[PDB]
């Protein structure tokens, strides 16, 4: 296939723990970006068969969606807030090192970028 298998969602010996932090991350960031009407191209990894990219998982070397985050937060897959936004991160410049600064999909991330940057403004103390 051209596409990797997708990133692991669950850890299965990692003890449950929350944080405010990581609660703010899935119930205001990640539901925030997830209900966007410009949602949709990053709820799932990029399908590089289905949409015909050969190069695109040669370009990225870290593969990430917010379909994977989402899991990630409901299995209590970070140790820590940090981890998550790093995804969210990645999933961002993924898009804006591979896709042409013209193209619609470099503007719905901006849209959905804006938005993250502003609620992670807002971030709760680690207390």
Known sequence: S???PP????????????TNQLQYLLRV????????????????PVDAVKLNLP??????????????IK???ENNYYWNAQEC???????????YIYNKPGDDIVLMA????????QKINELPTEE
């Open 29 to 44: 960031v990640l539901k925030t970006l997830w209900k966007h009407q410009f949602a949709w191209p990053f709820q799932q």
């Open 85 to 95: 936004i790093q995804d969210f991160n990645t999933m961002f410049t993924n898009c």
């Open 2 to 4: 051209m596409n990797p």
């Open 7 to 18: 990133p692991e969602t669950s850890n299965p010996n990692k003890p449950k723990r929350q």
């Open 55 to 68: 190069d695109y998982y040669k370009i990225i070397k870290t593969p990430m969606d917010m379909g994977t």
């Open 71 to 73: 899991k990630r937060l």
């Open 110 to 117: 901006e849209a959905l970028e804006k938005l993250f940057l």
